[PDB]
RNA sequence: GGAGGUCAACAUCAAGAACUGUGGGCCUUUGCCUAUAGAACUUAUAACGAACAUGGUUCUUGCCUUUUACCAGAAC
C-alpha cells in the first residue's frame, strides 16, 4: 500500500538528511538495515508494485551519490560497482544492492484499466561495462 | 480653482525637460558603452573681455574616465536662514497612561534580581459529572445485587 | 565583470550599499518593522510626549506577550491602560497567523519533499508540536466547561 | 551589544555622498518601451462557519489531526 | 450572517474566476490581422 | 486499475453505504468517531 | 516531436512542455469496452497527421 | 537553435573598433599572425601582473 | 474675534445623505492594508494585504477575479495608472515593483530604498512614480529607465503618505514628525511647511476638484489649500482618533476611518460631522481587531470600500431615502477650537 | 569622367501581406472616397546571418546542508 511506500522513502530521506558527515560504512550499513527490513517484511508483494521499484532505484542512487560527493564527484567512471558492493572485508562498503533489476514499464494508459501485463523493461540502474549483480529478493523465501 | 489647462501644460513642460536632462546624464555617464544609445562658446568671462572657446579634449579611451571620481563620504551642513514656527493649539490622564515595569520569566538581560511575585479559574464542575458517577454507581449496585 | 573589478580598484567600494531582503535575513526584518509599527500606535495613544523609557519598556511587554502566546500562558499584566493592551493583543494576533500559516505551508512542502532546506525541517517540527499542544489543552478545557 | 534600534538610517546621509560607477546587472536595459492606454439488525445494545481565528478553525484542526497525529 | 443580517451579502471567497492567465486588462490591436 | 478495481453500480454502491451506515449507528460518538472518509467498503455480487 | 513529448525513433528527445497529463477523470468516452484495436497507432502516425 | 530566435538589434551599428580606431592613440599596421599571437601573450601577461 | 463665531452660525451647510453596509467580502488571510480601484472601468478593486498577496476583486458581483502574488513581506500600498496600463505595488521588503496588467506579471523593479516603503503615487502627466517610507526621503523614480532621478531630502521621520499633483506644489507628503511639506521638484526643495498638527500625520487625500488636501492627524482633521498653503477649514472632531485614513469625494463628502472602529463622515466645506458608525467587527474576532486600515471611493462617488484588521473588506452604500425626510444628522453647533 | 577601397559619416531594414508622393471630391488638420506616378533592400517549408552565443526577471523541475556555479522546459 502507498502509505508504507511513502514511509520507506521517508526513512531513506531520513538517513540522508540526518547524517552530518557520518563517514561511509555507517551510511551503507544504515541502508542495508533499512532495506532488509522492507524486503523482509513484504517479501512477495514487492514484485508487483511499480512506484516502489521506482523509489528503490532513486533512493539507492541517492546514497551512492552521498558517498560520492563525500569526496568530490558524481563521475561514474571513478566508481565502478566494485567500490560499493565488495564486502567490508575486501574494503568495500558492502552495501546490499537490490536497485538494479529491470523495471516493467508497460504503456501506462491502458494499465490504468486492463492490467496489460509486462511488455517492456526500463533499465533501473546501470554500469559502464555491465556484469550484473544479484539482488536480495532472490535470496529471501516468499511467505506462501 | 483647480488650475486651468495651459497652465498644467506648462509646469508639465519645464519639468519633463528637466528630467530628460537628468536621465540623459546618468545614462551617458556609465560604462555600458551602449547605454548612451538610449537617450557652446558658453564663456563670456569677465565681460568676455578676451573672447574664448571652450573645447572638450577627447580622452584616451583606455584610461579611466573621470580621473577625479571616487567613492568618498561627506557630511553636509544643514544650513538654513529662516525658522518655521511650529504652531500648535497631567491631572486625570496619568491615572490612565501609567505603564508598569517589565519583569519577564525568560530573559534577564542585565542580571537584575527581583521580588519573586513579579516573576511568580473561578467556575466549578458541571453536573454532567455528578450524574455520570452516580448513574454508573446505581447500575453498579443493581448489577452486584 | 572586469569593468567592475577595475573601477573598484580605482574608485573604492561604495559606502552606502543598501541591501535587500532575502531568504536568510527575512525574519529579522519582519520583526523589525513590526516593532516599529507598534511604536507608532502606542506613541499616539499616550497623551503627549513621554516616550523613550515608556516606549522601550512597552516593547519589552510585546516580546513578553509573544513568548507567552507561544507557551500558552494566558498573560494578564497587573495594571496597565486598556487601550495599550488592546494594541498588543491586536499585533500579536497578527504575528500569530503569520506563524501558524507558515507552519502549514512548509509542512506541505516537506510532505512532497520538494527542496526544503535542512533546518527548515527541524524548525517546522517545533512550530507543529507547539500548535498540537495548544489544541490539546483547548480540547480539555472545553471538555470541562 | 544587541540592541533594538530606536531609529533608521536617513536616506539623506547616503544622498550627500559621491557616486561610485559600478555597473549592476539588473540595471541593464530591459523593456525600453512604454505602453500607453487608449430480525438481526435489532440485536445490538443501541435501540432506536468561518471563525476568524486559526486554532479554533475546522481546517487547522483537520491538519493537526493528520500530521502531528 | 445576522451579524449584518439582511441587506448584507456575506460572501466568503476562494479559488478564482477569470483564470490566472486571462488578461485582466484587454489588449488593443486596432487593425484586424487575418494572416 | 478500473477493471481490477470495484465498479460502481447503484445497487452495490448502496449496499456499501447501507451496511456502513447501520454500523455508524451501533457505536455512540461519545466513545469514538467513525467517519465515512476513513472507511472503505467492498462488495461481491454478479457485477463486481 | 517535442511539443507532443514524442520521439522519432532516431530522433532528439526533449522535455514534456505540457507536463501535467496525469489529471484525468474516470470517464467513459474513449474507454476500452467501446473501442476497436485493429492496427496499433505507432508514434510516427502522431507526428505525421 | 531553430525553435527560439534572437532577432538582432538594429543600431548595434557602433562597433568597438570603429570607435577606437578613430582616436589619436591607436594606429594601424600589418604584421605576421604568429607574431601578433606573441604580442598578445606579452600583453595579457603584463596586465594580469 | 467673536465676529468669527457669529459668522459660523449662519451658513448652515450642505445636506448630504447617510451611508450603510451593503456587502462584506472575506478571503484574505491577513490584515488588509490598501485598496486601489480602476481609474477607468470601475470593475475591480486591487487589494493589498498582510499575507503578501494582492487579490483583484470584482466591483459589481463581489467575486474574486484573480490573485497577483509575488511579494515576500507585507504589501503596504498599491496604485493604478490612468495612462498606462500598469500597476505599481510596493511592500516592506523594500521593493517597488511595477506590474503589467495585460499579462498579469511583473515587469520592472525600481530599487534603492534603504528600508521599508510605505507609500507610492503616480504623477498624472509625467510618467513618474513617486515613493517613500522609513528612510525619510521621497524618491522620484523615472518609469522606463528605473533611475531615481531625484531625491527629495527632507523631513526628520518616517514618511507616511505621498501625493502627486499636476501643477506646482507637485508632491506633498506627511511624516511622523508632524508636518506636511509642499514640494517644488525642480528646485529640489521645500516650498512650504504646514506645521500645525500635533503628532504624526497619518493620512491625506486630494480633493478631486477643489484643489486642496485634507490632512488628517491623530485627532484633528484639517484641510489646507494649495497654491498658498493656506489653512482653510478645521473639521469638528472630538478625539475620535487615531485616524488611519481619509477619502474625499466628488460630492464633497469626506470619509475618515478610526481605529476605535468608527466611521466618521463629514461635509467637506464645513466641518460638520453628519454620521458615525460602529463597524460590526466580525464572527470570532478580538475587540481590538475592529479598525479600518484603508478607504477609497469608486469613480462614481457613490460606493465605499474599506479594509479592516479582521481580514475583510466591507463595501458601504449611500442610502437614497434621505432628503430631509427624517434624514438629519448631528445638527450644526459650531464650537470653540 | 571611369574603375576600385577589409575607407568614413548620415539615413533605413519585419508589416491589414504590409512602401511613398501627387491630383480631385467630402467631413473639418487628422481622416474618408476616388484618380495618378514611382517603387532600392528583406521575406512563404516565411526573412536582415541557406549562420548561432550569453545575460536578466518570473514561473515549473533536477542536482540537494546554504550562496556563487549549475541541471532542462516555458513566458516576457
Answer whether any strand J atom is within 7 A of the Cβ of H29. Answer: no
> Is the distance from CB of I21 to CB of I314 less than 8 angstroms?
yes
Which helix (H) or strand (E) segment is D59 a member of? helix D58-66
Identify the residue whose cell numbers are 517589565. Answer: B102
Q: Where are the alpha helices (DSSP H) in C25-118?
A: 26-45, 52-71, 82-110
**Burial class, H39, CB count within 10 angstroms (exposed 0-12 / middle 13-18 / buried 19+):** exposed
Backbone torsions φ then ψ of I39, nearest 5 degrees: -80, -5
Which helix (H) or strand (E) segment is B13 a member of? helix B8-29
Structural domain of I321: 1-337
Backbone torsions φ then ψ of B126, nearest 5 degrees: -105, 135
> Is the distance from CB of B8 to CB of I125 less than 8 angstroms?
yes
DSSP state of I86: B
Provide the grid cell at D52. Answer: 476568524
Identify the residue whose cell numbers are 449507528. Answer: F25
* Chain gaps in chain I, named by the residue before each (C–N > 2.5 Å): none
Spatial strand order of the sheet with E9-11 comes to E9-11, I20-25, I312-317, I303-308, I294-297
Q: Which of I266, I120, I136 is nearest to I207 (CA)?
A: I266
Nearest-angstrom CA–CA distance, B13 and I126 = 9
Give, as ranges, the nucleotides of chain J with any atom within 7 Å of a protein CB: 8-9, 12-14, 16-17, 44, 46, 48-49, 51-67, 72-76
Contact at CB, A110 and G31, closer than 8 angstroms: no
Task: Please report, rounded to whole angstroms, the spatial distance between the CA atom of protein residue G1 and the C1' atom of nucleotide J76.
Answer: 25
**Burial class, B50, CB count within 10 angstroms (exposed 0-12 / middle 13-18 / buried 19+):** exposed
> Is the distance from CB of I214 to CB of I246 less than 8 angstroms?
yes
* Total of domains in chain I: 1
Q: Which of I17, I14, I13, I61 is nearest to I318 (CA)?
A: I17
Nearest-angstrom CA–CA distance, I55 and I67 = 4
Nearest-angstrom CA–CA distance, I17 and I320 = 7
DSSP state of A18: H
DSSP state of I110: E
Backbone torsions φ then ψ of D23, nearest 5 degrees: -115, 115
Q: Which of I313, I328, I326 is nearest to I21 (CA)?
A: I313
- What is each CA distance from B63 to B34, B58, B68, C21, H25, in whole angstroms? 18, 11, 12, 37, 11
Other residues' Cβ atoms within 10 Å of the Cβ of residue I85: 23
Answer whether any strand J atom is within 7 A of the Cβ of I73. Answer: no
For chain E, the residue count is 35
The overall longest dimension of chain E from CA atoms, in Å, is: 58
> Is the distance from CB of I68 to CB of I83 less than 8 angstroms?
no
Backbone torsions φ then ψ of I8, nearest 5 degrees: -70, -5
CA dihedral A78, A80, A84, A86 (to 10 degrees): -130
The string of DSSP letters for chain F reads -TTTS----HHHHHHHHHHHHHHHHTS-TTT----GGG------SS--
Nearest-angstrom CA–CA distance, H20 and H9 = 21
Provide the grid cell at A33. Answer: 538495515
Strands I20-25 and E9-11: parallel
Q: Where are the alpha helices (DSSP H) in chain H?
A: 16-21, 33-48
> Is the distance from CB of F2 to CB of F33 less than 8 angstroms?
no
Task: Please report, rounded to whole angstroms, the spatial distance between the CA atom of protein residue A53 and the C1' atom of nucleotide J70.
Answer: 29
Nearest-angstrom CA–CA distance, C70 and I285 = 19
Provide the grid cell at I256. Answer: 475618515
Rounded to the nearest 5 degrees, what angle is found at the Cα of A126, between the Cα atoms of A125 and A131?
A: 125
Nearest CA-CA distance, residue D6 and chain E, Å: 40
Spatial strand order of the sheet with I189-194 comes to I159-164, I171-175, I179-184, I189-194
List chain E residues with CB under 8 Å of D38. Answer: 28
Which helix (H) or strand (E) segment is A31 a member of? helix A25-41
Identify the residue whose cell numbers are 501485463. Answer: A117
What SS3 class is residue A142? coil
* Chain gaps in chain H, named by the residue before each (C–N > 2.5 Å): none
Non-local (6+) Cβ contacts of I273 within 8 A are I235, I236, I237, I264, I265, I266, I329, I330
- From the alpha carbon of I71, which nucleotide's C1' atom is closest? J58
- From the alpha carbon of I107, which nucleotide's C1' atom is closest? J57
Other residues' Cβ atoms within 10 Å of the Cβ of residue F46: 7
Q: Which of I170, I117, I108 is nearest to I144 (CA)?
A: I108
Nearest-angstrom CA–CA distance, I328 and A32 = 85
Which helix (H) or strand (E) segment is I206 a member of? strand I204-206
Identify the residue whose cell numbers are 467513525. Answer: F34
Rounded to the nearest 5 degrees, what angle is found at the Cα of I332, between the Cα atoms of I326 and I333?
A: 135
Rg from Cα positions in chain F: 13
Identify the residue whose cell numbers are 522492507. Answer: A38
Provide the grid cell at I235. Answer: 473639521
The CATH number covering residue I329 comes to: 2.130.10.10
Nearest-angstrom CA–CA distance, H29 and A87 = 71
Nearest-angstrom CA–CA distance, I124 and I165 = 7
C58-83 as b/e: b if 16+ CB within 10 A = bbbbbbbbbebbeeeeebeeeebbeb
Q: Which of I273, I210, I281, I288 is nearest to I238 (CA)?
A: I273
SS (HEC) of E1-35: CCCCCCCCEEECCCCCCCCCCCCCCCCCCCCCCCC
> Is the distance from CB of I275 to CB of I18 less than 8 angstroms?
yes
Contact at CB, F26 and D44, closer than 8 angstroms: yes
> Is the distance from CB of I44 to CB of I34 less than 8 angstroms?
no
Nearest-angstrom CA–CA distance, I78 and I185 = 23
Q: Which of I291, I285, I277, I283 is nearest to I245 (CA)?
A: I291
Provide the grid cell at B117. Answer: 511575585
Non-local (6+) Cβ contacts of D51 within 8 A are D57, I283, I284
What SS3 class is residue I121? strand
- From the alpha carbon of H6, which nucleotide's C1' atom is closest? J52
CA dihedral I69, I71, I73, I77 (to 10 degrees): -90
- The backbone region for F32, taken as left when phi is positive above 0, alpha when psi lies in -120 to 50, beta otherwise, is beta
CA dihedral I329, I334, I336, I337 (to 10 degrees): 60
List chain A residues with CB under 8 Å of F38. Answer: none
Q: Which of I22, I30, I124 is nearest to I73 (CA)?
A: I30
DSSP state of C34: H
Contact at CB, G31 and A114, closer than 8 angstroms: no
Contact at CB, F2 and A115, closer than 8 angstroms: no
Nearest-angstrom CA–CA distance, F36 and A28 = 43
The end-to-end CA distance of chain B, in Å, is 101
Resolution (A): 3.6
β-partners of residue I11 are none
Nearest-angstrom CA–CA distance, G17 and G6 = 11
**Burial class, I179, CB count within 10 angstroms (exposed 0-12 / middle 13-18 / buried 19+):** buried
- Asked if B75 is an interface residue toward chain C (Cβ–Cβ < 8 A), one would say no
DSSP state of B64: P
Task: Please report, rounded to whole angstroms, the spatial distance between the CA atom of protein residue I85 and the C1' atom of nucleotide J59.
Answer: 22
Q: Which of I295, I92, I119, I173 is nearest to C35 (CA)?
A: I92
> Is the distance from CB of I261 to CB of I276 less than 8 angstroms?
no
DSSP state of C58: H
Nearest CA-CA distance, residue F22 and chain D, Å: 8
> Is the distance from CB of F4 to CB of A113 less than 8 angstroms?
no
Backbone torsions φ then ψ of I99, nearest 5 degrees: -130, 170
Nearest-angstrom CA–CA distance, I320 and I328 = 13
**Burial class, A84, CB count within 10 angstroms (exposed 0-12 / middle 13-18 / buried 19+):** buried
- What is each CA distance from I6 to C54, I3, I274, in whole angstroms? 44, 5, 21
Q: Which of C141, D47, B142 is nearest to B134 (CA)?
A: B142
**Burial class, A136, CB count within 10 angstroms (exposed 0-12 / middle 13-18 / buried 19+):** middle
Answer whether any strand J atom is within 7 A of the Cβ of G15. Answer: yes
Provide the grid cell at F4. Answer: 481490477
Nearest-angstrom CA–CA distance, C88 and I14 = 41
Interface of D with E in 12-51 (CB under 8 A): 38, 49-50
Amino acid at each position: 500500500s502507498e502509505e508504507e511506500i511513502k514511509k520507506f522513502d521517508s526513512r531513506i530521506r531520513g538517513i540522508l538528511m540526518a547524517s552530518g558527515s557520518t563517514t561511509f560504512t555507517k551510511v551503507a550499513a544504515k541502508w542495508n538495515t533499512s532495506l532488509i527490513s522492507l524486503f523482509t517484511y513484504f517479501r512477495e508483494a514487492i514484485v508487483a508494485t511499480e512506484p516502489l521499484l521506482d523509489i528503490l532505484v532513486k533512493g539507492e542512487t541517492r546514497i551512492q551519490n552521498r558517498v560520492k560527493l563525500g569526496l568530490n564527484s558524481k563521475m561514474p567512471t571513478r566508481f565502478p560497482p566494485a567500490v560499493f558492493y565488495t564486502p567490508k572485508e575486501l574494503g568495500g562498503l558492502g552495501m546490499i544492492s537490490a536497485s538494479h533489476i529491470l523495471i516493467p514499464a508497460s504503456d501506462l494508459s491502458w494499465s490504468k484499466q486492463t492490467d496489460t501485463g509486462i511488455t517492456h523493461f526500463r533499465a533501473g540502474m546501470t554500469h559502464e561495462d555491465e556484469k550484473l549483480i544479484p539482488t536480495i529478493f532472490r535470496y529471501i523465501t516468499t511467505w506462501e | 480653482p483647480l488650475p486651468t489647462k495651459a497652465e498644467i501644460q506648462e509646469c508639465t513642460a519645464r519639468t519633463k525637460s528637466y528630467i530628460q536632462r537628468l536621465v540623459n546624464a546618468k545614462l551617458a555617464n556609465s560604462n555600458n558603452r551602449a547605454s548612451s544609445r538610449y537617450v557652446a562658446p558658453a564663456n563670456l568671462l569677465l565681460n568676455n573681455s578676451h573672447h574664448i572657446e571652450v573645447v572638450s579634449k577627447q580622452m584616451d579611451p583606455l584610461l579611466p574616465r573621470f580621473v577625479g571620481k571616487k567613492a568618498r563620504k561627506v557630511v553636509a551642513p544643514t544650513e538654513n536662514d529662516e525658522v518655521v514656527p511650529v504652531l500648535h493649539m497631567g491631572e486625570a490622564d496619568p491615572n490612565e497612561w501609567k505603564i508598569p515595569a517589565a519583569v519577564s520569566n525568560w530573559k534577564n538581560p542585565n542580571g537584575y534580581t527581583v521580588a519573586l511575585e513579579r516573576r511568580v479559574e473561578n467556575n466549578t464542575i458541571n453536573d454532567g459529572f455528578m450524574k455520570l458517577s452516580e448513574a454508573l454507581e446505581n447500575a453498579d449496585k443493581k448489577a452486584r445485587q | 565583470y572586469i569593468g567592475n573589478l577595475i573601477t573598484r580598484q580605482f574608485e573604492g567600494r561604495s559606502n552606502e550599499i543598501v541591501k535587500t531582503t532575502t531568504k536568510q535575513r527575512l525574519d529579522a526584518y519582519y520583526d523589525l518593522e513590526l516593532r516599529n509599527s507598534v511604536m507608532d500606535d502606542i506613541l499616539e495613544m499616550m497623551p503627549e510626549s513621554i516616550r523613550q523609557k515608556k516606549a522601550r519598556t512597552i516593547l519589552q511587554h510585546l516580546s513578553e506577550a509573544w513568548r507567552c502566546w507561544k507557551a500558552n500562558i494566558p498573560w494578564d499584566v497587573p495594571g496597565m491602560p486598556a487601550p495599550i493592551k488592546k494594541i498588543i493583543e491586536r499585533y500579536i494576533k497578527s504575528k500569530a497567523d503569520a506563524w501558524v500559516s507558515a507552519a502549514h505551508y512548509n509542512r506541505e512542502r516537506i510532505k512532497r519533499g520538494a527542496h526544503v532546506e535542512k533546518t527548515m525541517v527541524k524548525k517546522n517540527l517545533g512550530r507543529l508540536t507547539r500548535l498540537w499542544i495548544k489544541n490539546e489543552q483547548e480540547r480539555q478545557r472545553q471538555i470541562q466547561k | 551589544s544587541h540592541r533594538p534600534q530606536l531609529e533608521a538610517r536617513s536616506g539623506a546621509k547616503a544622498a550627500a555622498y559621491t557616486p561610485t560607477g559600478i555597473e549592476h546587472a539588473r540595471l541593464l536595459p530591459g523593456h525600453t518601451t512604454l505602453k500607453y492606454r487608449k430480525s438481526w439488525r435489532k440485536g445490538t445494545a443501541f435501540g432506536r462557519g468561518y471563525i476568524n481565528d486559526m486554532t479554533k478553525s475546522e481546517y487547522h484542526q483537520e491538519f493537526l489531526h493528520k500530521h502531528v497525529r | 450572517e445576522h451579524p449584518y443580517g439582511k441587506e448584507v451579502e456575506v460572501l466568503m471567497e476562494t479559488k478564482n474566476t477569470q483564470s490566472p492567465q486571462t488578461p485582466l486588462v484587454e489588449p488593443v490591436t486596432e487593425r484586424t490581422k487575418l494572416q | 486499475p478500473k477493471d481490477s478495481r470495484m465498479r460502481l453500480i447503484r445497487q452495490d454502491v448502496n449496499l456499501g453505504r447501507a451496511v456502513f451506515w447501520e454500523i455508524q449507528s451501533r457505536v455512540p460518538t461519545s466513545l469514538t468517531s467513525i467517519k465515512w472518509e476513513n472507511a472503505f467498503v467492498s462488495v461481491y455480487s454478479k457485477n463486481n | 516531436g517535442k511539443a507532443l513529448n514524442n520521439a522519432i525513433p532516431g530522433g532528439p528527445k526533449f522535455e514534456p512542455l505540457y507536463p501535467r497529463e496525469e489529471e484525468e477523470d474516470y470517464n467513459e468516452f474513449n474507454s476500452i469496452d467501446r473501442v476497436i484495436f485493429r492496427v496499433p497507432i505507432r508514434s510516427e502516425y502522431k507526428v505525421a497527421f | 537553435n531553430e525553435l527560439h530566435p534572437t532577432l538582432p538589434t538594429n543600431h548595434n551599428k557602433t562597433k568597438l573598433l570603429k570607435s577606437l580606431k578613430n582616436t589619436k592613440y591607436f594606429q594601424q599596421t600589418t604584421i605576421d599572425w604568429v607574431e601578433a599571437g606573441l604580442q598578445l601573450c606579452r600583453q595579457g601577461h603584463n596586465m594580469l601582473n | 474675534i467673536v465676529n468669527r463665531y457669529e459668522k459660523l452660525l449662519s451658513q448652515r451647510p450642505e445636506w448630504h445623505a447617510p451611508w450603510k453596509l451593503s456587502r462584506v467580502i472575506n478571503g484574505h488571510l491577513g490584515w488588509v492594508r490598501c485598496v486601489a480601484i480602476d481609474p477607468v472601468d470601475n470593475e475591480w478593486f486591487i487589494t493589498g494585504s498582510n499575507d503578501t498577496t494582492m487579490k483583484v476583486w470584482d466591483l459589481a458581483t463581489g467575486k474574486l477575479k484573480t490573485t497577483l502574488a509575488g511579494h515576500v513581506m507585507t504589501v503596504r500600498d498599491v496604485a493604478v495608472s490612468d495612462r498606462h496600463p500598469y500597476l505599481f505595488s510596493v511592500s516592506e521588503d523594500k521593493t517597488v515593483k511595477c506590474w503589467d496588467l495585460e499579462k498579469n506579471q511583473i515587469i520592472r523593479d525600481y530599487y534603492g530604498h534603504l528600508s521599508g516603503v510605505r507609500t507610492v503615487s503616480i504623477h498624472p502627466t509625467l510618467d513618474l512614480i513617486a515613493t517613500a517610507g522609513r528612510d525619510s526621503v521621497i524618491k522620484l523614480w523615472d518609469m522606463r529607465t528605473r533611475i531615481p532621478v531625484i531625491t527629495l531630502v527632507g523631513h526628520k521621520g518616517p514618511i507616511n503618505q505621498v501625493q502627486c499633483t499636476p501643477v506646482d506644489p507637485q508632491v506633498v507628503s506627511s511624516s511622523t514628525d508632524a508636518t506636511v511639506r509642499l514640494w517644488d521638484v525642480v528646485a529640489g526643495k521645500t516650498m512650504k511647511v504646514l506645521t500645525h498638527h500635533k503628532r504624526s500625520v497619518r493620512a491625506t487625500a486630494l480633493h478631486p476638484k477643489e484643489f486642496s488636501v485634507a490632512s488628517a492627524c491623530t485627532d484633528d482633521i484639517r484641510s489646507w489649500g494649495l497654491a498658498e498653503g493656506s489653512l482653510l477649514t478645521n473639521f469638528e472632531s472630538e478625539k475620535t482618533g487615531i485616524i488611519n485614513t481619509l477619502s474625499i469625494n466628488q460630492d464633497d463628502v469626506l470619509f475618515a476611518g478610526g481605529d476605535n472602529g468608527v466611521l466618521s463622515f463629514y461635509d467637506y466645506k464645513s466641518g460638520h460631522k453628519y454620521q458615525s458608525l460602529a463597524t460590526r467587527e466580525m464572527v470570532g474576532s478580538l475587540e481590538g481587531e475592529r479598525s479600518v486600515l484603508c478607504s477609497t471611493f469608486d469613480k462614481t462617488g457613490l460606493r465605499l470600500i474599506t479594509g479592516e484588521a479582521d481580514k475583510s473588506i466591507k463595501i458601504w452604500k449611500q442610502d437614497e431615502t434621505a432628503t430631509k425626510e427624517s434624514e438629519p444628522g448631528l445638527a450644526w453647533n459650531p464650537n470653540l477650537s
